[PDB]
Tab-separated table of N, CA and C and ligand atoms in Angstrom:
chain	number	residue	atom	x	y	z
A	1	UNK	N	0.851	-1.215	0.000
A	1	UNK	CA	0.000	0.000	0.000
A	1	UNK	C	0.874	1.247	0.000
A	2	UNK	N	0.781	2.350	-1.220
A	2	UNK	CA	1.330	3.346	-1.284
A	2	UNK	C	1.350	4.395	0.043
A	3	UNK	N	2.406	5.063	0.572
A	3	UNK	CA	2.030	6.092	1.348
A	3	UNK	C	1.399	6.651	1.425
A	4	UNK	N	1.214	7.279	0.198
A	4	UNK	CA	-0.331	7.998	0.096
A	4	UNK	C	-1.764	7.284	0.340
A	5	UNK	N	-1.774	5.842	-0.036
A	5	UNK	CA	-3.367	5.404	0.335
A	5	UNK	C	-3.302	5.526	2.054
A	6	UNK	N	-1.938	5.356	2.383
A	6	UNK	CA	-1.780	4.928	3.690
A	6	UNK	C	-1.964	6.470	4.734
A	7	UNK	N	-1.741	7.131	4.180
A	7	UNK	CA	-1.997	8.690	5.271
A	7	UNK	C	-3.245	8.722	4.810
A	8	UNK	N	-3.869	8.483	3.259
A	8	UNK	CA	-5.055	8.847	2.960
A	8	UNK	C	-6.478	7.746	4.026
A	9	UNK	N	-5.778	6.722	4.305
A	9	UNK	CA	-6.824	5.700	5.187
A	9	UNK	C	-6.505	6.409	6.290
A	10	UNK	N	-5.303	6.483	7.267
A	10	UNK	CA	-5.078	7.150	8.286
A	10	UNK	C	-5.693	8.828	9.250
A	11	UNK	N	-5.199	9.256	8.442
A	11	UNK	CA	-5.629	11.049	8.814
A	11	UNK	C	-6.940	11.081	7.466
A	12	UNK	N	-7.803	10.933	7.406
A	12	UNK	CA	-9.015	11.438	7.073
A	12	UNK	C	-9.280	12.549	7.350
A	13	UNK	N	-9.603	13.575	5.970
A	13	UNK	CA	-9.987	14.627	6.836
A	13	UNK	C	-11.479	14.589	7.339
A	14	UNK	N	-11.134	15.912	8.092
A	14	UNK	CA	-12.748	16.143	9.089
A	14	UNK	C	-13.387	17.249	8.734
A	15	UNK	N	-14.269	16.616	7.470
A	15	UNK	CA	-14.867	18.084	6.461
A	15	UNK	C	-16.233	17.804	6.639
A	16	UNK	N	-16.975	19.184	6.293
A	16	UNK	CA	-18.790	19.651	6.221
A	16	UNK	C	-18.940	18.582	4.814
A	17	UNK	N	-20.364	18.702	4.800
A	17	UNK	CA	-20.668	17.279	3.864
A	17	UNK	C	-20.549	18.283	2.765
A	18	UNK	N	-21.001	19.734	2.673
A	18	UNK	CA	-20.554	19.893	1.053
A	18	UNK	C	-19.729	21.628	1.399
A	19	UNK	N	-18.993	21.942	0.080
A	19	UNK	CA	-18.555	23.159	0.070
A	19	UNK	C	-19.260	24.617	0.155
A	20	UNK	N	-20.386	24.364	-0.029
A	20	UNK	CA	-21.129	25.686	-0.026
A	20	UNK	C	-21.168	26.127	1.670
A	21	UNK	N	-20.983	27.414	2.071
A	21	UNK	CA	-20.601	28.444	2.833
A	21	UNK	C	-22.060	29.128	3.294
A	22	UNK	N	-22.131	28.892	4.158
A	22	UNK	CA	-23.795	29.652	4.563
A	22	UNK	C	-23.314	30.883	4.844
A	23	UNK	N	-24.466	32.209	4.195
A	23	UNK	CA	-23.742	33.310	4.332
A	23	UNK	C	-23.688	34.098	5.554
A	24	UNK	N	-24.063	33.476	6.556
A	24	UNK	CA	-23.854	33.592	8.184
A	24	UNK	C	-22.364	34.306	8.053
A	25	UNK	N	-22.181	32.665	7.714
A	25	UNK	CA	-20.010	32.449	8.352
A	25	UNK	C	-19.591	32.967	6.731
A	26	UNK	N	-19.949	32.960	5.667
A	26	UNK	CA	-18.915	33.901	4.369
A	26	UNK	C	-19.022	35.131	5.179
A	27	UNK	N	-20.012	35.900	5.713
A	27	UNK	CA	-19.973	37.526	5.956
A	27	UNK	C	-19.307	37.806	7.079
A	28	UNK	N	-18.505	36.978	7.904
A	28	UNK	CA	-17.159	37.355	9.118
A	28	UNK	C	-16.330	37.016	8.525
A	29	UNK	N	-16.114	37.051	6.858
A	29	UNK	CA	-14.967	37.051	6.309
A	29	UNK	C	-14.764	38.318	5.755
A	30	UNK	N	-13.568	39.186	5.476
A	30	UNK	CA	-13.353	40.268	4.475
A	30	UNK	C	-12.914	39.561	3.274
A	31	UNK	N	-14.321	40.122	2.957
A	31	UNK	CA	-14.546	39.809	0.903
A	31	UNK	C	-14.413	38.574	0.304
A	32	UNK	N	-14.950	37.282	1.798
A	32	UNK	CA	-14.580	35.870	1.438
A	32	UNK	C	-13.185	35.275	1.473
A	33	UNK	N	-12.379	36.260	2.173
A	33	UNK	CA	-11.038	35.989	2.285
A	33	UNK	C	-10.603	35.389	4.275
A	34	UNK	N	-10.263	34.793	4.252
A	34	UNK	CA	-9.364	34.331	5.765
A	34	UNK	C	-8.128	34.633	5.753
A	35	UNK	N	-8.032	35.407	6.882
A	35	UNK	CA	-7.177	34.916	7.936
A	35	UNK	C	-6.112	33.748	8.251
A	36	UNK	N	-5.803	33.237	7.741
A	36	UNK	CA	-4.628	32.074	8.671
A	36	UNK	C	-2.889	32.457	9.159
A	37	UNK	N	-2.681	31.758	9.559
A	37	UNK	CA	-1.464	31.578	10.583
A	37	UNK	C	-0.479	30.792	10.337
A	38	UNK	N	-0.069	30.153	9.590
A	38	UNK	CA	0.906	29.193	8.693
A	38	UNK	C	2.640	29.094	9.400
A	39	UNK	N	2.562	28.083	10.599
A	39	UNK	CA	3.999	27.694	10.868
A	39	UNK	C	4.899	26.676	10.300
A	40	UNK	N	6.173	27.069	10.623
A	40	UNK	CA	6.946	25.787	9.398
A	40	UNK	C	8.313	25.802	10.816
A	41	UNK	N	8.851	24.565	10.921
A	41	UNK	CA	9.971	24.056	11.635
A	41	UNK	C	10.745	23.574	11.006
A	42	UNK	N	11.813	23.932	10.152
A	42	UNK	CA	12.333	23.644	8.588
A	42	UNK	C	13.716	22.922	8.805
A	43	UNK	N	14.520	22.086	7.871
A	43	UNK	CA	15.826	21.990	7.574
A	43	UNK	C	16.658	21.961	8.537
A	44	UNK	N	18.020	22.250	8.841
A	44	UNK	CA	18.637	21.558	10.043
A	44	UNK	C	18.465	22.270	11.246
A	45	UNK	N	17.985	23.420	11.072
A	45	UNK	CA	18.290	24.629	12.050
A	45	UNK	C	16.453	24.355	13.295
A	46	UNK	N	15.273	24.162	12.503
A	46	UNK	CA	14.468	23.549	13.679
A	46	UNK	C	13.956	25.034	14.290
A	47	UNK	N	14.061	26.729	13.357
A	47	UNK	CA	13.572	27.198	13.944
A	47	UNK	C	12.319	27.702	13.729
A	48	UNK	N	11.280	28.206	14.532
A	48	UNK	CA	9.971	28.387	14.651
A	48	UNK	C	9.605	29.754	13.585
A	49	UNK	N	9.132	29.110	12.284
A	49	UNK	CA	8.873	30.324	11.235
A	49	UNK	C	7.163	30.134	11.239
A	50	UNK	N	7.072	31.440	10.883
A	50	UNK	CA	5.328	31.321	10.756
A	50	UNK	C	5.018	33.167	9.991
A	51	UNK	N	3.991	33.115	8.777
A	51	UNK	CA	3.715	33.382	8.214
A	51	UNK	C	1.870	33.821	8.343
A	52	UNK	N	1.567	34.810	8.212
A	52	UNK	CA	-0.314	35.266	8.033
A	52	UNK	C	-0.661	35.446	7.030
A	53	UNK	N	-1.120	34.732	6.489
A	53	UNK	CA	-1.518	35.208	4.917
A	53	UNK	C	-3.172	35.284	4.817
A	54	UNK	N	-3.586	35.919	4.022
A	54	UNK	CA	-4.811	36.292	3.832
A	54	UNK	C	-5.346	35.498	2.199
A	55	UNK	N	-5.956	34.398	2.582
A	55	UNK	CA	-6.493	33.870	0.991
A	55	UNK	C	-8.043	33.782	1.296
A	56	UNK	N	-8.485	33.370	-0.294
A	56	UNK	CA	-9.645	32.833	-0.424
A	56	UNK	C	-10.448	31.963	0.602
A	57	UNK	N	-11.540	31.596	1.308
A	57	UNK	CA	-11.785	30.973	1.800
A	57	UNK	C	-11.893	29.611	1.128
A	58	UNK	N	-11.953	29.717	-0.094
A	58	UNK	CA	-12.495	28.318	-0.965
A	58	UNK	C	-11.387	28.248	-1.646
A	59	UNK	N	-9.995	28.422	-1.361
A	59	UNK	CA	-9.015	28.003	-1.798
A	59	UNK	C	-8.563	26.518	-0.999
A	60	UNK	N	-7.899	25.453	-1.987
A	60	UNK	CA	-7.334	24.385	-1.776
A	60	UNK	C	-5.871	24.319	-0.927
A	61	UNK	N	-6.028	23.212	0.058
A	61	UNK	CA	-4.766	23.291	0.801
A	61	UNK	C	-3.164	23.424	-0.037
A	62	UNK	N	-3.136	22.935	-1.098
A	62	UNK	CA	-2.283	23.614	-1.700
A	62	UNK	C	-2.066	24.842	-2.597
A	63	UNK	N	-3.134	25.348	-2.856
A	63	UNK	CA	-2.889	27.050	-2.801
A	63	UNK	C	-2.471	27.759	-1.665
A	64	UNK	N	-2.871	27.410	-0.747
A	64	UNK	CA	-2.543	28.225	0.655
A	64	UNK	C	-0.925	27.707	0.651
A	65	UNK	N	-0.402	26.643	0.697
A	65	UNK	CA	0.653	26.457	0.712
A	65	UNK	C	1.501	27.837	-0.364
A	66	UNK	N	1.088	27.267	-1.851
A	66	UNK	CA	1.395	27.840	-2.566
A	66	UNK	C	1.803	29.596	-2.175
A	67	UNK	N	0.669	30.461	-1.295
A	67	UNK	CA	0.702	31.434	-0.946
A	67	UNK	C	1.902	31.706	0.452
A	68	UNK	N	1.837	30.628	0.770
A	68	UNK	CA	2.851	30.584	1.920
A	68	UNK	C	4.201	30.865	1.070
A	69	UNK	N	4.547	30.158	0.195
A	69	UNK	CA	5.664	30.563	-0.976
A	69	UNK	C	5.827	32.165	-1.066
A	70	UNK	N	5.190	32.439	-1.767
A	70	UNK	CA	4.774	33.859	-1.955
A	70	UNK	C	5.275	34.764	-1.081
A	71	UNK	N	4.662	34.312	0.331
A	71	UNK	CA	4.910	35.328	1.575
A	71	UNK	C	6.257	35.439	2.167
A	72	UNK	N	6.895	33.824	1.668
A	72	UNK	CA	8.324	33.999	2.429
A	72	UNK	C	9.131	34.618	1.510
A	73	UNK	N	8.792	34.711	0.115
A	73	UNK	CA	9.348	35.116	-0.919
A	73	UNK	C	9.671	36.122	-1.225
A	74	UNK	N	9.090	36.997	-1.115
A	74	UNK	CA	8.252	38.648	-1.367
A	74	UNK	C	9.681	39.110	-1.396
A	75	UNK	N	10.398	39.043	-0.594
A	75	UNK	CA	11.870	40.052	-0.650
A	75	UNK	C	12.530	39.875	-1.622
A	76	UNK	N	12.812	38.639	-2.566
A	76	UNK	CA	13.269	38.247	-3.526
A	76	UNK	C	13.402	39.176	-4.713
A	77	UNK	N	12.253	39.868	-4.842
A	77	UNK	CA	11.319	40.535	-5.958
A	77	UNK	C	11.594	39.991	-7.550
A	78	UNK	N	11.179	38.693	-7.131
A	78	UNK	CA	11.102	37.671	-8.040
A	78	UNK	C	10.138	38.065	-8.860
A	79	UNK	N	10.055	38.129	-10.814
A	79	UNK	CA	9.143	38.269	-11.628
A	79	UNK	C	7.830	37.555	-11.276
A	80	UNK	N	6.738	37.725	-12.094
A	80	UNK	CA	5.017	36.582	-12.198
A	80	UNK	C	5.883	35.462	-12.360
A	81	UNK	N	7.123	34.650	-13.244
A	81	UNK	CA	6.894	33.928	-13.985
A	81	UNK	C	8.279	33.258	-13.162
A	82	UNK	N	9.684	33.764	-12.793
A	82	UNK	CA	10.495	32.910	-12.035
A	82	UNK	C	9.551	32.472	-11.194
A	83	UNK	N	8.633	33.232	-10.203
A	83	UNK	CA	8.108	32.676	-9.221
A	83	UNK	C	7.092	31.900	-9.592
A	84	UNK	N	6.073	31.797	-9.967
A	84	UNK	CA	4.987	31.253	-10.652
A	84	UNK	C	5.747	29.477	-10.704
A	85	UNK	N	6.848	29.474	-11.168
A	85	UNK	CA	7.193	28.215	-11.860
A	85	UNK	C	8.532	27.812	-10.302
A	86	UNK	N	8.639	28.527	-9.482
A	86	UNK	CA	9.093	27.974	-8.739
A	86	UNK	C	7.785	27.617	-7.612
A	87	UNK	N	6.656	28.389	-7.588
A	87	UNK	CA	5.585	27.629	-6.982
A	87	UNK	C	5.331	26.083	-7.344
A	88	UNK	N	5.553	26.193	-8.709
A	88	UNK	CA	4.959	24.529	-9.151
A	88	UNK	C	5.974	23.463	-8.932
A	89	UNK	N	6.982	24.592	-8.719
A	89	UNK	CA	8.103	23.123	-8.553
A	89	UNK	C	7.844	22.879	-7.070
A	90	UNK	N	7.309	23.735	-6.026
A	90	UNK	CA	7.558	23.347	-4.690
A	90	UNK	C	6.239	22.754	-4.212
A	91	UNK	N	5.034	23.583	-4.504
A	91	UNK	CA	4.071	23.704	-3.514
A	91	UNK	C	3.579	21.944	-3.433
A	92	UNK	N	3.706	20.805	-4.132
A	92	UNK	CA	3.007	19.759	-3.672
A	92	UNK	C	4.378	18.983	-2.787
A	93	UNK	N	5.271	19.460	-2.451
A	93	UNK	CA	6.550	18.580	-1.786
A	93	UNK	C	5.915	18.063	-0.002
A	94	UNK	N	4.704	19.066	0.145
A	94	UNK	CA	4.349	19.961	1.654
A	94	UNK	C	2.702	19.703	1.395
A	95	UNK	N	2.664	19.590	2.628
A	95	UNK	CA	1.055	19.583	3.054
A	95	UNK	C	1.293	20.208	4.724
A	96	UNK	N	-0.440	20.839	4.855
A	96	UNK	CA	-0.843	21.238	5.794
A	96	UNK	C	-1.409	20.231	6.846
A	97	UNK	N	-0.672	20.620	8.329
A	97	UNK	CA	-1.712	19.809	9.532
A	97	UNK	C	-2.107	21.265	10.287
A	98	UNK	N	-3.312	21.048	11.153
A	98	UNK	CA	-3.764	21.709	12.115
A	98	UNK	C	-2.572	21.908	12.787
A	99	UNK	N	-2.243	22.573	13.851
A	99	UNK	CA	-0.948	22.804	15.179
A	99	UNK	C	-1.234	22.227	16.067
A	100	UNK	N	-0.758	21.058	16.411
A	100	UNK	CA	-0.259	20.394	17.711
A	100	UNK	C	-1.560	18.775	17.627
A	101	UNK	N	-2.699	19.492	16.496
A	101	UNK	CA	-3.204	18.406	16.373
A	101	UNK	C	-3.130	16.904	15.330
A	102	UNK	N	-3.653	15.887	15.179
A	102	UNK	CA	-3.117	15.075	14.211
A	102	UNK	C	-4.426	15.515	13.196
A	103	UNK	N	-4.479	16.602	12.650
A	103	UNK	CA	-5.756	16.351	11.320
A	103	UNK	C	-5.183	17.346	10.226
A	104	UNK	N	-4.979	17.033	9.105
A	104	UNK	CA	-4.216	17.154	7.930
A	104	UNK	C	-5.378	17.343	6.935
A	105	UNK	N	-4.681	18.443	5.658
A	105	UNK	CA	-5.359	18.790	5.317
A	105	UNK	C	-5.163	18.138	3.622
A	106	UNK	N	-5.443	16.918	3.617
A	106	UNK	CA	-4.881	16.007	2.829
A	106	UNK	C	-5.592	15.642	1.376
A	107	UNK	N	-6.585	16.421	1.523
A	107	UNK	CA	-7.734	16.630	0.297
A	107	UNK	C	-8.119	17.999	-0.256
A	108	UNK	N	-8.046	18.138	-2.329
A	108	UNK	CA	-8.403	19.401	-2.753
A	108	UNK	C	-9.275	19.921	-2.378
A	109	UNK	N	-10.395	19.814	-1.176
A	109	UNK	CA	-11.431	20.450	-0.634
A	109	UNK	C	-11.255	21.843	-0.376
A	110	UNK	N	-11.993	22.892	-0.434
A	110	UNK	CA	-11.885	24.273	0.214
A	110	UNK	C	-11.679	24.234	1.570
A	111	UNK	N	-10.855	25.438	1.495
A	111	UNK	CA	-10.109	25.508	2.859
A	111	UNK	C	-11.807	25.141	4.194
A	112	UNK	N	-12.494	26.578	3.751
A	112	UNK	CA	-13.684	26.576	4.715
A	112	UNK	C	-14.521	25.483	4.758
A	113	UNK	N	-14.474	24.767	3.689
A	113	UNK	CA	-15.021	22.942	4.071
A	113	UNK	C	-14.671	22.320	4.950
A	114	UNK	N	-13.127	22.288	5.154
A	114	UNK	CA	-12.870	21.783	6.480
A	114	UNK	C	-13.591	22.075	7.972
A	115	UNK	N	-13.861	20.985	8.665
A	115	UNK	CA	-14.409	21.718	9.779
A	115	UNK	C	-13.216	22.358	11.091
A	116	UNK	N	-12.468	22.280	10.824
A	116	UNK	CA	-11.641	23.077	11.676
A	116	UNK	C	-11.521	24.605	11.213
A	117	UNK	N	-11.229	24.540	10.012
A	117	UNK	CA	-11.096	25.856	9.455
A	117	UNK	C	-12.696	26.703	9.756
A	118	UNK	N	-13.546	25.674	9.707
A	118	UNK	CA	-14.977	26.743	9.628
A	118	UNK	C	-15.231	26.505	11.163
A	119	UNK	N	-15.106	26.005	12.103
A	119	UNK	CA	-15.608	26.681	13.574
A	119	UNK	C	-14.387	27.771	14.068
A	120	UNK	N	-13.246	27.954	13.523
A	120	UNK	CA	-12.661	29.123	13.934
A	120	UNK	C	-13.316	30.509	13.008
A	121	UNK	N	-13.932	30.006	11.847
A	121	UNK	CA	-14.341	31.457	11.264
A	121	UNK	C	-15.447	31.948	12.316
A	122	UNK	N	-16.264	30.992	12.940
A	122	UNK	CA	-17.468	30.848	13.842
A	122	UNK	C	-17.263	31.295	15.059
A	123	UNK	N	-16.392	30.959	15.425
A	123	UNK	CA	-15.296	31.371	16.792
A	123	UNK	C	-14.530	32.422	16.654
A	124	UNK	N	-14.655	33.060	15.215
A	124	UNK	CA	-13.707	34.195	14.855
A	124	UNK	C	-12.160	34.515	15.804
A	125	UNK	N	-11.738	32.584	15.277
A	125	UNK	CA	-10.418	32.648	15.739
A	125	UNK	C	-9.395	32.654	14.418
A	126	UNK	N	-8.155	32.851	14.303
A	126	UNK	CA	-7.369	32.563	13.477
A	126	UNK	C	-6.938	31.223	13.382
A	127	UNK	N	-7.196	29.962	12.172
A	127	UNK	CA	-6.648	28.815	11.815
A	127	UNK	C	-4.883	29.093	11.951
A	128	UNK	N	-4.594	28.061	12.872
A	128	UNK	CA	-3.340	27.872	12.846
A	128	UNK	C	-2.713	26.442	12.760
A	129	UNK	N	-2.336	26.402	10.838
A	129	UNK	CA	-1.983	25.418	10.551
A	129	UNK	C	-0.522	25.467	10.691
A	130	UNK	N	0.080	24.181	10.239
A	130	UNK	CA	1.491	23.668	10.086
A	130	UNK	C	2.315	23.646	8.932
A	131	UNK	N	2.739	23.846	7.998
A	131	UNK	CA	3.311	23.191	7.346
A	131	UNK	C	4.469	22.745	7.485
A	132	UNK	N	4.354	21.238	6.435
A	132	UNK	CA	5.306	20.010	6.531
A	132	UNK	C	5.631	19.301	5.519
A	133	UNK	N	6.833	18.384	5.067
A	133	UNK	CA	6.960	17.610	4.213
A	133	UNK	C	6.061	16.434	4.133
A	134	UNK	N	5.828	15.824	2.991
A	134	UNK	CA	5.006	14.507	2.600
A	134	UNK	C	5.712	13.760	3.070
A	135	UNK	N	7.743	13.872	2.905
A	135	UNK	CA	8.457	12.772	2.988
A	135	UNK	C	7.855	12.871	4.749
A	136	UNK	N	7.607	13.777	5.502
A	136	UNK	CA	8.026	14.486	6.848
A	136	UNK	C	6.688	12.832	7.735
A	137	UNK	N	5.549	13.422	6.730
A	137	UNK	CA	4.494	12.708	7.056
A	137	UNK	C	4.245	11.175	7.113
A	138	UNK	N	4.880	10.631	5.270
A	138	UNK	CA	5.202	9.066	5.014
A	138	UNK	C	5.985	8.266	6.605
A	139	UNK	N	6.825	8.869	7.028
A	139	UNK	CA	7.739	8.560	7.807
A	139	UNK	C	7.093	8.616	8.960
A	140	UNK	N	5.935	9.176	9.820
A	140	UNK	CA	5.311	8.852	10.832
A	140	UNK	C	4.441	7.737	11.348
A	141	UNK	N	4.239	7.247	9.731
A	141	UNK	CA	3.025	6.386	9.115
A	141	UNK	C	2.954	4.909	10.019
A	142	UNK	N	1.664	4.743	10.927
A	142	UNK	CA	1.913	3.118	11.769
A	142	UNK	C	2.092	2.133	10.304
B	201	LIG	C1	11.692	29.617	-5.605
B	201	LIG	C2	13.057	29.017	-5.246
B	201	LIG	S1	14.320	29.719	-6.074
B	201	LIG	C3	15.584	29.985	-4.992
B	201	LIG	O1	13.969	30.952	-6.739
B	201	LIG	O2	14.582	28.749	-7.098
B	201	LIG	C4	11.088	30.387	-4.436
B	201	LIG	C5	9.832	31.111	-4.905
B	201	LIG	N1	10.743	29.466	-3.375
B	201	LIG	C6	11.496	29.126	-2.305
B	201	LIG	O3	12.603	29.636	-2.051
B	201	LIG	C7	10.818	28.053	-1.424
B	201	LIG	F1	9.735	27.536	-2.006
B	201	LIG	C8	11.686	26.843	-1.176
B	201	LIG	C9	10.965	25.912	-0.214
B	201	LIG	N2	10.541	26.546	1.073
B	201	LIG	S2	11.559	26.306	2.363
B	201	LIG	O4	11.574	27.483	3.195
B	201	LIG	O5	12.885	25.930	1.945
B	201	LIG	C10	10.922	25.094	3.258
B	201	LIG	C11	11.692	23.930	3.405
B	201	LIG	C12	11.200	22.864	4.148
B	201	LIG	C13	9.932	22.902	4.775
B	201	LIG	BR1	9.280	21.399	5.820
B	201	LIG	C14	9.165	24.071	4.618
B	201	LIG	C15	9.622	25.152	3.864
B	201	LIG	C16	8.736	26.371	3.785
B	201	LIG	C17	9.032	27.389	4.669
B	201	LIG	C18	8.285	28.557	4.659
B	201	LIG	C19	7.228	28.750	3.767
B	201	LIG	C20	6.910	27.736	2.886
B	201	LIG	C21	7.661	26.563	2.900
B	201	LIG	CL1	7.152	25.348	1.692
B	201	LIG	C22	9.927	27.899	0.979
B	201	LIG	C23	10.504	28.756	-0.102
């Protein structure tokens, strides 16, 4: 069994049965956009980076990644198109978990589908995910 079926049987995510957004919880968003909190514990050094980026609510866990790129990037003042194509080379290496919890965000679902992501819009708290390697994840695997 591939790693992937194997995190995919394992960490299930914990999503609303469909994507549509009741406009309760879209309207404590600005302009359908969230809020998140994006930490990373990287490479040999192990130190505590973290990033706020503001996306779509119905963006996919790897766009948000993708945007996490972006944010650490920005100083670079990298063209649309070096960067653009260094997004594609990176953004699927990495996936998102919740912080400190085991629930991963392991499916193209919208972010606000998830139910973690949508009782903090409810709770009008900030999502504070993780990011991590796939290899990071395979390797935890019972
Ligand atoms: C392209 C690379 S380059 C030098 O122009 O060819 C630019 C746009 N991207 C990056 O420099 C980047 F994607 C490389 C990968 N990460 S990372 O900081 O090296 C990193 C390594 C390991 C883990 Br686990 C997590 C990360 C990471 C940290 C912070 C934000 C996002 C990530 Cl994926 C980021 C930058």
């Amino acid at each position: 069994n591939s790693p992937h079926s194997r995190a995919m049987y394992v960490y299930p995510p914990n999503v609303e049965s469909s994507p549509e957004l009741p406009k309760h919880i879209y309207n404590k968003l600005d302009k359908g956009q969230i809020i998140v909190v994006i930490w990373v514990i990287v490479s040999p050094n192990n130190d505590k980076q973290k990033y706020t980026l503001k996306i779509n609510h119905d963006c996919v866990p790897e766009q948000v990644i993708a945007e996490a790129i972006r944010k650490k990037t920005r100083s670079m003042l990298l063209s649309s198109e070096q960067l653009k194509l260094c997004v594609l080379e990176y953004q699927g290496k990495y996936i998102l978990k919740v912080c400190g919890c085991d629930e991963y965000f392991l499916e193209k679902y919208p972010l606000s589908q998830y139910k973690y992501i949508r009782s903090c819009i409810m709770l009008g708290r900030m999502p504070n995910l993780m990011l991590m390697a796939k290899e990071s994840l395979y390797s935890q695997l019972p």
